[PDB]
Each structure stands twice: as C-alpha cells, then as structure tokens.
Ligand binder design. Structure first.
Ligand SMILES: [Ca+2]
Ligand SMILES: [Ca+2]
Ligand SMILES: [Ca+2]
Ligand SMILES: [Ca+2]
Length: 148
C-alpha cells in the first residue's frame, strides 16, 4: 500500500478541519477575504491587491484561491525553508570556531583547509574582503548568509 492511505476517514476529516483555520466558510478554498480575516487576526491589515498578491504566489492552478493541496505545498516549502535557516546558522557556527559572532581570515583559512582546498592567504583574504559589507575585517552572520 501507500503510507498516504494509512489514515482513517475520521482522521482525514480531522486533518481537513485544521484547514478551516484559513478556510472559514468550509468550502475548500481560501479567498482574499478569508486571508484578510486571518491577517487582521494577527494584527496586520493588507489591501485586496496585497491579499491577491500573496494568494497569487501560491495559487498553482491559477483560479484565484488557495485550496488545501496548494496550502499544504506552501507550508511544506516553508517548513523545509526554516530548516535550511537552522542549518545555515549551524554552518556559521562551524566557521566561527571561537563563537565571537564574526568569521576571521584565520577561521576561514582553517575551514577551507579542512575541506580540502589549498588556497593562499591572499585568496582566502580575497574572500573575506569580497564578502565584507561593513568593512570591519570580519564576516558577521549576514555577510555569511550572502553565500549564495
Ligand atoms: Ca473558503
Ligand atoms: Ca488555486
Ligand atoms: Ca570568530
Ligand atoms: Ca563584516
């Protein structure tokens, strides 16, 4: 069988109830009105245009609303995304061996060396310099997030 079918109908019904947090009239799609409702419940207040722009960047079939599949797709990407931030933070820590919040040439020297590379001091210092944005001689976490 398939793991997806390893639930009960009452359980799928219950899973579907959770969608109603956003899909308040229960019809199976989120409208701009419903999403505006949710936003305003969080203290925000966007326009019809802004609400239609949020919806559009998740609206896979083009019909102007968010069904439960699109929502779950959107959520899964979000969940994988926050994990990718956890691990860029993890990676910053590995480079920043002294936990000072800033990566030195020395610290980048070290990691590069332990990763195989055989670059010069200049080439490594050419990295810190190319990566710096506040000219402080070190690489804070944000200049590090610029590792695209
Ligand atoms: Ca609805
Ligand atoms: Ca849709
Ligand atoms: Ca450091
Ligand atoms: Ca810096």
């Amino acid at each position: 069988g398939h793991m997806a079918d390893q639930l009960t109908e009452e359980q799928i019904a219950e899973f579907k109830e959770a969608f109603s947090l956003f899909d308040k009239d229960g019809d199976g799609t989120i409208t701009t009105k419903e999403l505006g409702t949710v936003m305003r419940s969080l203290g925000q207040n966007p326009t019809e245009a802004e609400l239609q722009d949020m919806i559009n960047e998740v609206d896979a079939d083009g019909n102007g609303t968010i069904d439960f599949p699109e929502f779950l797709t959107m959520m899964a990407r979000k969940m994988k995304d926050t994990d990718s931030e956890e691990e860029i933070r993890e990676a910053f820590r590995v480079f920043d061996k002294d936990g000072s919040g800033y990566i030195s040439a020395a610290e980048l020297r070290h990691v590069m060396t332990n990763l195989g590379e055989k670059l010069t001091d200049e080439e490594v210092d050419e990295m810190i310099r190319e990566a710096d944005i506040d000219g402080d001689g070190q690489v804070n976490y944000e200049e590090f997030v610029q590792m695209m």
